[PDB]
Amino acid sequence: ESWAQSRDEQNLLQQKRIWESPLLLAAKDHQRGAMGETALHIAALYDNLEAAMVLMEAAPELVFEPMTSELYEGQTALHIAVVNQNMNLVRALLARRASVSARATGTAFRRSPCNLIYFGEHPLSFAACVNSEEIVRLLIEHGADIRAQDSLGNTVLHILILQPNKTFACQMYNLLLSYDRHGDHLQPLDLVPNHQGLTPFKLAGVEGNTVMFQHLMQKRKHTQWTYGPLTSTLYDLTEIDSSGDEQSLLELIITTKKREARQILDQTPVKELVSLKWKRYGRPYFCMLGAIYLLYIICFTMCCIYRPLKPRTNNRTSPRDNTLLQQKLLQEAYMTPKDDIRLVGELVTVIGAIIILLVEVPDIGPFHVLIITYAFMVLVTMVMRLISASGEVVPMSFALVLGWCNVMYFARGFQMLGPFTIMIQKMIFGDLMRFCWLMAVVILGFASAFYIIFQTEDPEELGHFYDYPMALFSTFELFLTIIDGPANYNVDLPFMYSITYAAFAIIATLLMLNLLIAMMGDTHWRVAHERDELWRAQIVATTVMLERKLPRCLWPRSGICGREYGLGDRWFLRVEDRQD
Amino acid sequence: ESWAQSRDEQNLLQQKRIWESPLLLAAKDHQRGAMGETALHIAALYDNLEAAMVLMEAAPELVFEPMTSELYEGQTALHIAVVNQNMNLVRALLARRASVSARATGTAFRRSPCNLIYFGEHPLSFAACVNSEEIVRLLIEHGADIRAQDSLGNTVLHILILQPNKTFACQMYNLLLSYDRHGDHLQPLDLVPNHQGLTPFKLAGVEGNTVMFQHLMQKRKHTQWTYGPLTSTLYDLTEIDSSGDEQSLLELIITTKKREARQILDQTPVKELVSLKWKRYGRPYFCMLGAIYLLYIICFTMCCIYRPLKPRTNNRTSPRDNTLLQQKLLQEAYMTPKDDIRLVGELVTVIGAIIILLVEVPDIGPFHVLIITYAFMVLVTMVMRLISASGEVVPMSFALVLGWCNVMYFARGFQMLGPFTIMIQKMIFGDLMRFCWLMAVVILGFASAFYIIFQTEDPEELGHFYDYPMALFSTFELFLTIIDGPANYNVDLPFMYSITYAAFAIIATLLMLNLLIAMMGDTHWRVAHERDELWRAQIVATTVMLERKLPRCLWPRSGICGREYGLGDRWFLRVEDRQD
Ligand SMILES: CC(C)CCC[C@@H](C)[C@H]1CC[C@@H]2[C@H]3CC=C4C[C@H](OC(=O)CCC(=O)O)CC[C@]4(C)[C@@H]3CC[C@@]21C
Ligand SMILES: CC(C)CCC[C@@H](C)[C@H]1CC[C@@H]2[C@H]3CC=C4C[C@H](OC(=O)CCC(=O)O)CC[C@]4(C)[C@@H]3CC[C@@]21C
Ligand SMILES: CC(C)CCC[C@@H](C)[C@H]1CC[C@@H]2[C@H]3CC=C4C[C@H](OC(=O)CCC(=O)O)CC[C@]4(C)[C@@H]3CC[C@@]21C
Ligand SMILES: CC(C)CCC[C@@H](C)[C@H]1CC[C@@H]2[C@H]3CC=C4C[C@H](OC(=O)CCC(=O)O)CC[C@]4(C)[C@@H]3CC[C@@]21C
Ligand SMILES: CC(C)CCC[C@@H](C)[C@H]1CC[C@@H]2[C@H]3CC=C4C[C@H](OC(=O)CCC(=O)O)CC[C@]4(C)[C@@H]3CC[C@@]21C
Ligand SMILES: CC(C)CCC[C@@H](C)[C@H]1CC[C@@H]2[C@H]3CC=C4C[C@H](OC(=O)CCC(=O)O)CC[C@]4(C)[C@@H]3CC[C@@]21C
Ligand SMILES: [Mg+2]
Ligand SMILES: [Mg+2]
Ligand SMILES: [Mg+2]
């Protein structure tokens, strides 16, 4: 906001600085403006060729001079004439020995959501982005280095992938790569990583640049044979399944926050790779990891069904006291064979909860949080068991609910069941997290109204609202229509009740059907229309988690290795498809 | 998986075997490779004409030699040059006396979902499938037999129907059939069955090859007269209603597992045939078979309403014992006129259940299973009645529910009601069989939580959860909101209950609306959009069942017989339509 305010004022400052100097005004159609610009910059800016030539005759040092602002730092007139595509000025600027290697470190050039363009820092990178082949053919003739890297580390190959017109990005990727012609450099330009470690092939995957993914994939395709309609294609599979030493391209797509990246999961070498590694080793481990967790939660349940309880030593403290049984002490808890059989299962439970923490906590989405909370609630149950602290029903009840709802995590192994878990998340963190603020406020209004209406009345007849916390809970239950409307029929209720509850009943049906239409638009189109895409993104997330947390003996590398077939040491995936 | 692994390794083995031999490498641009191939095979594979000619000059025995692998067994170079459509090589191979009758018995050629192509075994069958008319015009000139049959028994007529480009399949069907020119053979080529017994006309129906159904139907159309816009067309109806000796084409479409086959039910001779036989004899028997079954289930109900019961001889065994009446013994069950009137209806019931087993069990979808289970539960009721075994309420209650829900089978006679039964099946074996795994797991988590919260409390106030099987059943009922939320208001419930039940109530509404949107997508588009198609497939299934299980006197053959009209002994169906 404040920065956007300053840019505009600096841009309005610049228009004043042009008007003050008649020479700078003449350039518009040694003094410097608000942006640090010169007359050569302004003539290049508005494509004033004749003003630029007359100024460069007087000052030929003006060509070398960069803008001095923070917004346009390092920018020379050559940058301006390049993006404005004035060919004859670019020729004239190079004739006056313009630097083709100048770096524009200005904030307006840096990759940021505030800036609409990201063109890099070098005139090659500016020229390729504005799609001028000739200037690229002209700048390299004057010593411009294609291997130039930015503050982000991007070369021009990386920058073209980050451009909104993906078709022009393809041709300029072709042109600059054809101009390398070096074998002496340890990395060719397609193989040069940026500072994040992403190659141009990896960058197209992370950004969801689909056509740049496809063009780069043709370099990694070898066609073995063609049998009429059939053809056999062998895929390099080096970067899309790099594992054991570095993050995979599949791993980068999952961790990135771009929904466009997940379309790359539907591209051909990626798709059969994921489906193969899922069917080969992905499913039978995950269903085995599912069955072990299910027997664990059943073992945790039985220890909670048979928890140590004794008749209460105390007398009843009120007529409203319903307690009959209390927790045993520690020595009382274990003195019999049934207590020893439970002690085995409770020890299995705690050892299971410790193993959960070991495979989860030293590592650091939602099912991460649910199982860590479940393992945490188990340890609190043991701690209270050891010190004989009362209230163990509170950690267990969290753990029974959290422990069983983790069993729903293993629905994603089945193809139909997995997007149903997607529905549950989007309904609760979308439509529920929105509408609960409208919904609780109606509950607070009517529960307060319902409380004071029965505040004079006797609670024995109608105790829905006997104190204010129960009046909140009852009105919540009346909202969802899970308990009946309060009625006695043997006594006179207040007349203000019948008006309020009829007003409540209309709003509660109206608001609850509104939550249904909101959850209608969610699960129908966002999830059930895209069930195959969402389930595939679940597999890649599940498998990458499996690969990190499993030994090498269990997980063989996917594809077929060369050097027994003379292809390299790389792991190749063969796909046979029908071209018809 | 493992077989797909082996094929790729064998394909990568083959690329090594080419590189080792310089002669085999020269063929790529007497030794044999991994696939058993030769240099002539590899030259034919990559369309290397000049390498093939030089090799066949040296070895002319190489033309005769087949590949020796399991994957490509029996394949010669003539097969390879045919599918690759190298005309000049095919001419050159025939000039060296190539076998046109060689059979490729390899696993890659066999019809299987692992193999993308099914081309048959003979070079005629390969040439027609890759759509080369000239090679077919050339191979027959060298002695190729069109009547060749595979291990599946398919001739080239059958194979063309099994091809994904149905338009090219039509022309090659025309070309090969025009080349038969034999009357001496007992079956012409359109009439030659495969090993399954299917002709090319029957095969197009079973596979749902609609345009091959239409082209073959024109041969079975005779146009009687044309009256301006009106025309009268007479259909052969021989194979689409073969009955009394063999399965019909209608019967093949029902029993097959292809959804594409049911579009053939909407083709013109099929459609009016089904609608005619349904209206003529299909409905009035089925509604008669419906009314007889309805009076049977009403008779079974009245025998269960009036089942023999006496006051209990024992005393009450607990304060929680609600039993007042018990079953009579066998001699007590029948000693009065009302007992004799029930004995008639019970004998009608058992004789009815035996007749169900006779018309169902010696024969061996869902309503098959439901009525056999109903007839089985009836016989258990009699067995327990005879030996005075207690617990007869268990077989009856299964039989009352199963017996009445069979009456829903007769909804398909009515056109609107039939797809509603489709909805019930798809919702229960789709959306229910999926979502019950997510839904029971939430129930198990909260019922366990609800149990231990009230494990200390006294059950007399709140006995929803007094033991663990009732806590499961109550939480199931709270999930569907068919019983009210537990509340006392005269006693203090645990505070962990109000948190857990509010957590339960949100999830239970959220998950239950999710089941509604899932059942929304089911019944709307899968069934109600396709209600006429689903109801028509119900008729064909019902009628074919009727034809098997009814005497000849009740079911006359459809159409109009010739030989009283001089058309043959075949049964013809006349359809008058408006061509406008
Ligand atoms: C007494 C001992 C031998 C019992 C064995 C304990 C297991 C029942 C637990 C221990 C650690 C495991 C778990 C821990 C880590 C994973 C991650 C997993 O899901 C996520 O959190 C993924 C993130 C997301 O998708 O939201 C939860 C279960 C899983 C496979 C495991 C399931 C069950 C395991 C084998
Ligand atoms: C004893 C009571 C008070 C415990 C409180 C209940 C809630 C805190 C928990 C338990 C049941 C729910 C969970 C149950 C299952 C879902 C699935 C959901 O789905 C996904 O992760 C799909 C995306 C993916 O990871 O692939 C994530 C958490 C969620 C809403 C829940 C998180 C929180 C909930 C509301
Ligand atoms: C969407 C809406 C507009 C539906 C239209 C129906 C309501 C406008 C009517 C239905 C019958 C109700 C009435 C029925 C009876 C009650 C009792 C009330 O006075 C009493 O008798 C209270 C009893 C007592 O004092 O003991 C006055 C009107 C009231 C709330 C109601 C006013 C309005 C209600 C909701
Ligand atoms: C004492 C006697 C004379 C009473 C007569 C007994 C009938 C009530 C039963 C005997 C066998 C019959 C049935 C047995 C065979 C059929 C199959 C039918 O449905 C299927 O199973 C088709 C498969 C499917 O679509 O799922 C169910 C009832 C029906 C017509 C019959 C309905 C009723 C019938 C006439
Ligand atoms: C006493 C209690 C414990 C009996 C248990 C009830 C269920 C086992 C049964 C009885 C009612 C249901 C049936 C009722 C009717 C339907 C129609 C459905 O319809 C079709 O077959 C349409 C397809 C076709 O055949 O054309 C098949 C079975 C189904 C879901 C049900 C099969 C199973 C259900 C759940
Ligand atoms: C979709 C959701 C987020 C809608 C928003 C409403 C809930 C957040 C509020 C509504 C009023 C409820 C509260 C109302 C009163 C209860 C009683 C409880 O303590 C008691 O008084 C128990 C009684 C006893 O100990 O005898 C503490 C909070 C609780 C569960 C509630 C906490 C949260 C609830 C569900
Ligand atoms: Mg949402
Ligand atoms: Mg009620
Ligand atoms: Mg379904």
Coordinates of N, CA, C and O in Angstrom, one line a residue, chain A residues 224-228 230 279-280 301 304-305 307 309 320 322-325 393-394 396-398 400-401 404 408 411 416-417 420 423-424 427 432 460 463-464 470 473-474 476-477 480 482-484 516 520 523 560 564-567 574 576 578, chain B residues 1 5 7-9 11-13 15-16 19 45-46 75 83-84 109 116-117 119 126 164 434 438 441-442 444-446 448-449 451-453 455-458 461 468 484-485 489-492 495-496 498 501-502 505-506 510-511 513-514 517 520:
Chain A
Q224 N 12.2 -46.2 -29.2 CA 12.9 -47.5 -29.5 C 12.5 -48.1 -30.8 O 13.4 -48.3 -31.7
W225 N 11.2 -48.3 -31.0 CA 10.7 -48.8 -32.3 C 9.3 -48.4 -32.5 O 8.6 -47.9 -31.6
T226 N 8.9 -48.5 -33.8 CA 7.5 -48.1 -34.2 C 6.9 -49.2 -35.0 O 7.5 -49.6 -36.0
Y227 N 5.8 -49.7 -34.6 CA 5.2 -51.0 -35.2 C 3.8 -50.6 -35.7 O 2.8 -50.9 -35.0
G228 N 3.7 -50.0 -36.8 CA 2.5 -49.5 -37.4 C 1.9 -48.4 -36.4 O 2.5 -47.4 -36.2
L230 N 1.5 -49.0 -33.1 CA 2.3 -49.0 -31.9 C 3.6 -48.3 -32.0 O 4.3 -48.4 -33.1
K279 N 1.3 -49.0 -7.8 CA 0.8 -50.3 -7.8 C 1.9 -51.3 -7.4 O 1.6 -52.4 -6.8
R280 N 3.2 -51.0 -7.7 CA 4.2 -52.0 -7.4 C 4.5 -52.0 -5.9 O 4.5 -53.1 -5.3
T301 N -8.5 -49.1 21.9 CA -9.9 -49.0 22.3 C -10.1 -49.9 23.5 O -10.7 -49.5 24.5
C304 N -9.1 -48.8 26.8 CA -10.0 -47.8 27.3 C -11.3 -48.3 27.7 O -12.0 -47.7 28.5
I305 N -11.8 -49.4 27.1 CA -13.0 -50.0 27.5 C -12.9 -50.6 28.9 O -13.8 -50.5 29.7
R307 N -10.7 -49.8 31.3 CA -9.8 -48.9 32.2 C -10.2 -49.1 33.7 O -11.3 -49.5 34.0
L309 N -11.5 -49.0 37.2 CA -12.5 -48.2 37.8 C -13.0 -48.9 39.0 O -13.2 -50.2 39.0
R320 N -27.9 -33.5 42.2 CA -27.5 -33.5 40.8 C -26.2 -34.2 40.5 O -25.6 -34.0 39.4
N322 N -24.2 -37.5 39.5 CA -24.5 -38.8 38.9 C -23.4 -39.8 38.9 O -23.5 -40.9 38.4
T323 N -22.3 -39.4 39.6 CA -21.1 -40.3 39.6 C -21.3 -41.5 40.5 O -21.7 -41.3 41.6
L324 N -21.0 -42.7 40.0 CA -21.0 -43.9 40.7 C -19.7 -44.5 40.9 O -19.5 -45.2 41.9
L325 N -18.8 -44.3 40.0 CA -17.5 -45.0 39.9 C -16.4 -44.0 39.8 O -16.6 -42.8 39.4
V393 N -10.4 -39.4 31.7 CA -11.4 -39.5 30.6 C -11.2 -38.3 29.6 O -11.7 -38.4 28.5
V394 N -10.6 -37.2 30.0 CA -10.3 -36.1 29.1 C -9.3 -36.5 28.1 O -9.5 -36.3 26.9
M396 N -8.2 -39.5 27.1 CA -8.7 -40.7 26.3 C -9.7 -40.3 25.3 O -9.6 -40.7 24.1
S397 N -10.7 -39.5 25.7 CA -11.8 -39.1 24.8 C -11.3 -38.3 23.6 O -11.8 -38.5 22.4
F398 N -10.4 -37.4 23.8 CA -9.7 -36.8 22.7 C -8.9 -37.9 21.8 O -9.0 -37.9 20.6
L400 N -9.5 -41.2 21.6 CA -10.4 -42.2 20.9 C -11.0 -41.5 19.7 O -11.1 -42.2 18.6
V401 N -11.4 -40.3 19.7 CA -11.9 -39.6 18.6 C -10.8 -39.3 17.6 O -10.9 -39.6 16.4
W404 N -9.3 -42.8 16.0 CA -10.1 -43.5 15.0 C -10.2 -42.6 13.8 O -10.3 -43.2 12.7
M408 N -9.4 -42.9 8.9 CA -9.8 -42.3 7.6 C -8.7 -41.9 6.7 O -9.0 -41.7 5.5
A411 N -8.1 -44.2 3.6 CA -9.1 -44.2 2.5 C -8.4 -43.9 1.2 O -9.0 -44.4 0.2
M416 N -11.8 -44.5 -5.1 CA -13.0 -43.8 -4.9 C -13.0 -43.1 -3.5 O -13.6 -42.1 -3.4
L417 N -12.4 -43.7 -2.5 CA -12.5 -43.2 -1.2 C -11.7 -42.0 -0.9 O -12.1 -41.2 0.0
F420 N -13.1 -38.4 -1.1 CA -14.1 -38.2 0.0 C -13.5 -37.5 1.2 O -14.1 -36.7 1.9
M423 N -13.2 -33.9 0.4 CA -14.5 -33.2 0.7 C -14.6 -32.8 2.1 O -15.1 -31.7 2.4
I424 N -14.2 -33.7 3.0 CA -14.3 -33.4 4.5 C -13.4 -32.2 4.9 O -13.9 -31.4 5.7
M427 N -15.0 -28.9 3.2 CA -16.2 -28.5 3.8 C -15.9 -27.9 5.2 O -16.6 -27.0 5.7
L432 N -17.5 -24.5 6.6 CA -17.8 -24.5 8.0 C -17.0 -23.3 8.6 O -17.6 -22.6 9.5
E460 N -37.2 -27.5 36.9 CA -37.6 -28.9 36.9 C -38.5 -29.3 35.8 O -38.4 -30.4 35.3
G463 N -35.7 -27.7 31.9 CA -34.3 -27.4 32.3 C -33.4 -27.4 31.1 O -32.2 -27.7 31.3
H464 N -33.9 -27.1 30.0 CA -33.0 -26.9 28.8 C -32.1 -25.7 29.1 O -30.9 -25.7 28.6
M470 N -25.6 -24.2 29.8 CA -26.5 -25.2 29.2 C -27.4 -24.6 28.2 O -27.9 -25.3 27.2
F473 N -25.6 -24.6 25.0 CA -25.5 -26.0 24.5 C -26.8 -26.5 23.9 O -26.9 -27.1 22.9
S474 N -27.9 -26.2 24.6 CA -29.2 -26.6 24.2 C -29.6 -25.9 22.9 O -30.2 -26.5 22.0
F476 N -27.6 -24.6 20.6 CA -26.8 -25.3 19.6 C -27.5 -26.6 19.1 O -27.5 -26.9 17.9
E477 N -28.0 -27.4 20.1 CA -28.7 -28.6 19.7 C -30.0 -28.3 19.1 O -30.4 -29.1 18.2
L480 N -29.3 -27.5 15.3 CA -29.1 -28.6 14.4 C -30.2 -29.6 14.4 O -30.2 -30.6 13.7
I482 N -31.2 -31.7 16.7 CA -30.8 -33.0 17.3 C -31.4 -33.3 18.6 O -31.3 -34.5 19.1
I483 N -32.0 -32.4 19.3 CA -32.9 -32.6 20.4 C -34.2 -31.9 20.1 O -34.3 -31.1 19.2
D484 N -35.3 -32.4 20.7 CA -36.6 -31.8 20.5 C -36.8 -30.4 21.0 O -36.0 -30.0 22.0
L516 N -26.3 -26.3 3.6 CA -26.3 -27.4 2.7 C -26.0 -27.0 1.3 O -25.3 -27.7 0.5
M520 N -23.1 -27.9 -1.0 CA -23.4 -28.5 -2.3 C -22.4 -28.0 -3.3 O -21.9 -28.8 -4.1
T523 N -18.6 -29.9 -2.7 CA -18.3 -31.2 -2.9 C -18.6 -31.6 -4.4 O -18.0 -32.6 -4.9
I560 N 13.8 -48.9 -15.4 CA 14.7 -50.0 -15.7 C 16.1 -49.3 -15.9 O 16.3 -48.4 -16.6
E564 N 23.3 -52.4 -18.0 CA 23.0 -53.7 -18.5 C 22.3 -53.7 -19.8 O 22.0 -54.7 -20.4
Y565 N 22.0 -52.5 -20.3 CA 21.4 -52.3 -21.6 C 22.1 -51.1 -22.4 O 21.6 -50.7 -23.4
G566 N 23.2 -50.6 -21.8 CA 24.0 -49.6 -22.6 C 23.4 -48.3 -22.8 O 23.6 -47.7 -23.9
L567 N 22.6 -47.8 -21.8 CA 21.9 -46.5 -22.0 C 22.5 -45.4 -21.1 O 22.0 -44.3 -21.2
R574 N 9.9 -47.2 -19.8 CA 9.5 -47.5 -21.1 C 7.9 -47.5 -21.2 O 7.3 -48.1 -20.3
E576 N 4.7 -48.0 -23.9 CA 4.2 -48.3 -25.2 C 2.8 -47.8 -25.4 O 1.9 -48.1 -24.6
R578 N -0.4 -46.2 -28.4 CA -0.9 -46.3 -29.7 C -1.1 -44.9 -30.3 O -1.9 -44.1 -29.7
Chain B
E1 N 2.3 -56.9 -14.1 CA 3.4 -56.1 -13.5 C 4.7 -56.8 -13.9 O 5.6 -56.2 -14.6
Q5 N 7.2 -56.0 -16.8 CA 8.6 -55.9 -16.5 C 9.5 -56.7 -17.5 O 10.5 -56.2 -18.0
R7 N 8.7 -57.9 -20.6 CA 8.6 -57.5 -22.0 C 9.6 -56.3 -22.2 O 10.2 -56.3 -23.3
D8 N 9.7 -55.4 -21.3 CA 10.5 -54.2 -21.5 C 12.0 -54.6 -21.5 O 12.8 -54.2 -22.3
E9 N 12.3 -55.5 -20.5 CA 13.7 -56.1 -20.5 C 14.1 -56.8 -21.7 O 15.2 -56.7 -22.3
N11 N 12.7 -56.2 -24.6 CA 12.8 -55.2 -25.6 C 14.1 -54.4 -25.5 O 14.7 -54.0 -26.5
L12 N 14.6 -54.2 -24.2 CA 15.9 -53.6 -24.0 C 17.0 -54.7 -24.3 O 18.1 -54.3 -24.7
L13 N 16.7 -56.0 -24.1 CA 17.7 -57.0 -24.5 C 17.9 -57.0 -26.1 O 19.0 -57.2 -26.6
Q15 N 17.7 -54.5 -28.2 CA 18.5 -53.4 -28.6 C 20.0 -53.6 -28.4 O 20.8 -53.1 -29.1
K16 N 20.3 -54.4 -27.4 CA 21.7 -54.8 -27.2 C 22.1 -55.8 -28.3 O 23.2 -55.7 -28.8
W19 N 23.2 -54.2 -31.4 CA 24.4 -53.5 -31.4 C 25.6 -54.5 -31.4 O 26.7 -54.1 -31.9
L45 N 11.6 -54.2 -39.8 CA 11.0 -53.5 -38.6 C 11.2 -52.0 -38.8 O 10.2 -51.2 -38.5
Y46 N 12.3 -51.5 -39.2 CA 12.6 -50.1 -39.3 C 12.4 -49.6 -40.7 O 12.8 -48.5 -41.1
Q75 N 6.1 -65.3 -36.0 CA 6.1 -64.2 -36.8 C 7.3 -64.2 -37.8 O 8.4 -64.4 -37.4
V83 N 2.5 -54.9 -41.6 CA 2.0 -53.9 -40.6 C 2.7 -52.5 -40.8 O 2.2 -51.5 -40.5
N84 N 4.0 -52.6 -41.2 CA 4.7 -51.3 -41.5 C 4.4 -50.7 -42.8 O 4.8 -49.6 -43.1
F109 N 0.6 -60.9 -29.9 CA -0.4 -60.9 -30.9 C -1.8 -61.3 -30.3 O -2.8 -60.9 -30.9
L116 N -2.0 -53.8 -26.9 CA -2.8 -52.8 -27.4 C -3.4 -53.1 -28.7 O -4.5 -52.6 -29.1
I117 N -2.8 -53.9 -29.5 CA -3.3 -54.4 -30.8 C -3.7 -55.8 -30.8 O -3.1 -56.6 -30.1
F119 N -4.4 -58.1 -34.0 CA -4.5 -58.2 -35.4 C -4.7 -59.6 -36.0 O -4.7 -59.8 -37.2
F126 N -3.4 -59.1 -40.6 CA -2.6 -57.9 -40.3 C -2.8 -56.8 -41.2 O -2.9 -55.6 -40.9
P164 N -10.4 -50.5 -33.4 CA -10.9 -49.2 -32.8 C -11.4 -48.2 -33.9 O -12.1 -47.3 -33.5
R434 N -18.8 -47.3 -0.6 CA -17.6 -46.4 -0.4 C -17.7 -45.8 1.0 O -16.9 -46.1 1.8
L438 N -15.7 -44.7 5.8 CA -15.4 -43.4 6.5 C -16.4 -43.2 7.6 O -16.1 -42.6 8.6
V441 N -16.1 -45.6 10.9 CA -14.9 -45.3 11.6 C -15.1 -44.1 12.5 O -14.6 -44.1 13.6
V442 N -15.8 -43.1 12.0 CA -16.3 -42.0 12.9 C -17.2 -42.5 14.0 O -17.1 -42.0 15.2
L444 N -17.2 -45.5 15.3 CA -16.3 -46.3 16.3 C -15.5 -45.4 17.2 O -15.3 -45.7 18.3
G445 N -15.1 -44.2 16.6 CA -14.3 -43.3 17.4 C -15.1 -42.6 18.5 O -14.7 -42.4 19.6
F446 N -16.3 -42.2 18.1 CA -17.1 -41.4 19.1 C -17.9 -42.3 20.0 O -18.2 -41.9 21.2
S448 N -16.8 -45.1 21.2 CA -15.7 -45.4 22.2 C -15.5 -44.3 23.2 O -15.4 -44.4 24.4
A449 N -15.6 -43.0 22.6 CA -15.4 -41.9 23.5 C -16.7 -41.7 24.4 O -16.5 -41.4 25.5
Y451 N -18.7 -44.0 25.4 CA -18.8 -45.0 26.4 C -18.0 -44.7 27.6 O -18.5 -44.8 28.7
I452 N -16.8 -44.3 27.5 CA -15.9 -44.1 28.7 C -16.3 -42.9 29.4 O -15.9 -42.7 30.6
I453 N -16.9 -41.9 28.8 CA -17.4 -40.7 29.4 C -18.5 -41.0 30.4 O -18.6 -40.5 31.5
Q455 N -18.9 -44.1 31.6 CA -18.6 -45.4 32.2 C -18.6 -45.2 33.7 O -19.0 -46.2 34.5
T456 N -18.3 -44.1 34.2 CA -18.4 -43.8 35.7 C -19.8 -43.4 36.1 O -20.2 -43.7 37.2
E457 N -20.5 -42.8 35.2 CA -21.8 -42.2 35.5 C -22.9 -43.4 35.7 O -22.6 -44.5 35.3
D458 N -24.0 -43.0 36.3 CA -25.0 -44.0 36.5 C -25.9 -44.2 35.3 O -26.4 -43.2 34.7
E461 N -30.0 -42.6 34.6 CA -30.3 -41.3 34.0 C -30.0 -41.3 32.5 O -30.9 -40.8 31.8
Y468 N -20.9 -51.3 25.8 CA -20.2 -51.0 24.5 C -21.0 -51.3 23.3 O -21.0 -50.6 22.3
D484 N -32.9 -38.7 19.6 CA -32.5 -37.4 20.1 C -31.1 -37.5 20.8 O -30.7 -38.5 21.3
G485 N -30.5 -36.3 20.9 CA -29.3 -36.2 21.7 C -29.6 -36.4 23.1 O -30.6 -36.0 23.7
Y489 N -30.8 -32.9 32.2 CA -31.1 -31.5 32.7 C -31.5 -31.5 34.1 O -31.6 -30.4 34.7
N490 N -31.6 -32.6 34.7 CA -31.9 -32.8 36.2 C -30.7 -33.3 36.9 O -30.7 -33.6 38.1
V491 N -29.6 -33.5 36.2 CA -28.3 -34.1 36.7 C -27.2 -33.4 36.0 O -27.4 -32.8 34.9
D492 N -26.0 -33.5 36.5 CA -24.8 -33.0 35.9 C -24.2 -34.1 35.0 O -23.7 -35.1 35.5
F495 N -18.5 -32.9 31.6 CA -18.2 -31.8 30.7 C -17.6 -32.2 29.4 O -17.6 -31.5 28.4
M496 N -16.9 -33.4 29.5 CA -16.3 -34.0 28.3 C -17.4 -34.5 27.3 O -17.1 -34.6 26.1
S498 N -20.3 -32.8 26.6 CA -20.8 -31.7 25.8 C -19.8 -31.3 24.7 O -20.2 -30.8 23.7
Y501 N -20.0 -34.4 22.1 CA -21.2 -34.5 21.4 C -21.3 -33.3 20.4 O -21.9 -33.4 19.3
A502 N -20.8 -32.1 20.8 CA -20.8 -31.0 19.9 C -19.8 -31.2 18.8 O -20.1 -30.8 17.6
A505 N -21.7 -33.8 16.6 CA -22.9 -33.2 15.9 C -22.5 -32.5 14.7 O -23.2 -32.5 13.7
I506 N -21.3 -31.8 14.7 CA -20.9 -31.1 13.5 C -20.4 -32.0 12.4 O -20.8 -31.9 11.3
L510 N -22.0 -32.8 8.8 CA -21.1 -32.6 7.7 C -20.9 -33.9 6.8 O -21.0 -33.8 5.6
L511 N -20.7 -35.0 7.5 CA -20.6 -36.3 6.7 C -21.9 -36.7 6.1 O -21.9 -37.4 5.1
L513 N -24.5 -34.8 5.0 CA -24.7 -34.0 3.8 C -23.8 -34.4 2.7 O -24.1 -34.3 1.5
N514 N -22.6 -34.8 3.0 CA -21.7 -35.3 2.0 C -22.2 -36.6 1.3 O -22.0 -36.8 0.1
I517 N -24.8 -35.4 -1.3 CA -24.2 -34.9 -2.5 C -23.6 -36.0 -3.3 O -23.7 -36.0 -4.6
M520 N -26.5 -37.5 -4.7 CA -27.0 -36.5 -5.7 C -26.4 -36.8 -7.1 O -27.1 -36.9 -8.1

